[PDB]
Structure 1
């Protein structure tokens, strides 16, 4: 059983590690040789927030949109988005703004967004300083975390954080809504 089913979509440039974040979170698995994502995939994991069972339904799709535009169907019903860039590849961070516009175009206007700087294990190749991404996240009302799907750092935390924020929002909406029914 679960108390909540939260659809959370992974978005971000191809190669940033979205599928490995998914595999790490849902299966504790990581693949150095993962290929670009076929179509759309989702995987689930349930976590407890405030003693409630939150079932995360995490969606994943290839980041490259040149030939294949992500439709609103991908974003539809999503209450969270993990907007992932690769800390070692500045272009993926530069594209965060385009991903934010994609969210505006395709997703619920109140979608919870977490900026995720993935591949923190590549600190020797870091192209995006943490405080820069933080400042950007703060400016854009995004939560922010750096992860490494490879070494697992902050992967649990990233998902738990976004899911908790979503939980906080919908649990409060439920209380309000119940009152409307009363």
Structure 2
């Protein structure tokens, strides 16, 4: 691989961030991993995507600034729960402060559409104005692979420490 994109997952606890990671990389589903990787080729270039997870640190707003260090891309994840959706406002402000970056928004758990709170209509409008792309996903329906890859395509347009 000739390019390495560090991308981070954010948003409220419970949404599905951990599962969206294990889906896109390991095609698995739980009912925790530090980070998982996946390589794609874009314009003949091998791109490793390093996708970091929160270790549950988002629960009481304890995400380290170091989590965003050198991150060239990021996904905000909401839930079935308008609470998380409204909280997506918070994580946007968090990210542009600590990162550098290309951002995308995802509405996970679309498989449970029979318990929907706040429709697709608003989520698209919310995304369209705020310059970040949208993709309604489900980790169990699955727009998982599309969402991650769509983000990776977009980052591709953008472009001595010592070991102990």
Fold equivalence (TM over 0.5): yes
- Structure 2 distance, partners of 1:79, 1:127, is 31
Shift of 1:63: 5.6
Q: What is aligned with 1:64?
A: 58
Cα distance in 1 for residues equivalent to 2:46 and 2:138: 25
Alignment correspondent of 2:150: 161
Matches within 5 A, 1:33-52: 41-52=34-45
Runs of at least 4 residues off by over 4 Å? none
Distance of 1:130 and 1:54 partners within structure 2: 31
The equivalent position to 2:89 in structure 1, one of 85, 94, 97, is 97
1:112 matched residue in structure 2: 102
Q: List aligned pairs for 1:8-157, cutoff 5 A.
A: 8-32=7-31, 41-61=34-54, 62=56, 64-66=58-60, 69-86=62-79, 88-108=80-100, 111-150=101-140, 153-157=142-146
Unaligned runs of 5+ in 1: 171-182
User: What CA RMSD, in Å, does the superposition of the two structures yield over aligned residues?
Assistant: 1.4
TM superposition shift of 1:105: 2.1
Does the 8 Å CA contact 1:71/1:106 hold for their aligned counterparts? no
Q: How far 1:64 sits from its partner (Å)?
A: 3.0
TM-score with structure 2 setting the length: 0.91
Question: Aligned partners of 1:157, 1:50: CA distance in 2, in Å?
Answer: 17
Closer, same or farther: CA 52–128 of 1 in aligned 2, 3 Å: farther
SS state at 1:165 partner: helix
Structure 2 stretches of 5 or more lacking a match? 160-164
Q: What is the count of residue pairs matched by the alignment? A: 158
Q: Which residue of 1 aligns with 2:162?
A: none
Q: Deviations over 1:96-152 (max 9, x none)?
A: 0000011122111xx11100111111111111311211101111100110111116x
